[PDB]
């Protein structure tokens, strides 16, 4: 048969992610890493698979691997913050979401209103957690 490139396995994992085939997507991204472990986005994308599968420690670890390879990554900070939010690490989550916002502004990139919306939601959850 054929052994794909790492880029081809990333694209395959992306397709699987869009179809809620989260373990299969994560395994694909793992095969991309086996081919080229120096590409941050494979880890970021796999981190979101792990978050969807409720494997929070694995998602955090992949975010950390991505940030060691690309400390400027908006997506890695955004996913890290979203993971931390689910784990109720509110202050860290908010700081990571805010860092994603600042990096997106510095890099002149558009992610929708996704980051300000995530921030609003995170702050709401944090405040409710304290008051209860």
């Amino acid at each position: 048969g054929a052994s794909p490139s790492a880029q081809e396995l990333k694209e395959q994992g992306n397709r699987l992610f869009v179809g809620r085939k989260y373990p299969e997507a994560a395994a694909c991204y793992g095969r991309a890493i086996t081919r080229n472990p120096l590409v941050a986005v494979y880890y970021t994308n796999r981190a979101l698979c792990y978050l969807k599968m409720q494997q929070h420690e694995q998602a955090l670890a992949d975010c950390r691997r991505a940030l060691e390879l690309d400390g400027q990554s908006v997506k890695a900070h955004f996913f890290l913050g979203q993971c931390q939010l689910e784990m109720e690490s509110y202050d860290e989550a908010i700081a990571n979401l805010q860092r994603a916002y600042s990096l997106a502004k510095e890099q002149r990139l558009n992610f929708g209103d996704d980051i300000p919306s995530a921030l609003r939601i995170a702050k709401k959850k944090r405040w409710n957690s304290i008051e209860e």
Partner: peptide
């Protein structure tokens, strides 16, 4: 958020 968009973006 639009996680699918975030995942696929080549940025």
């Amino acid at each position: 958020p639009c996680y699918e968009a975030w995942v696929l973006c080549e940025y």
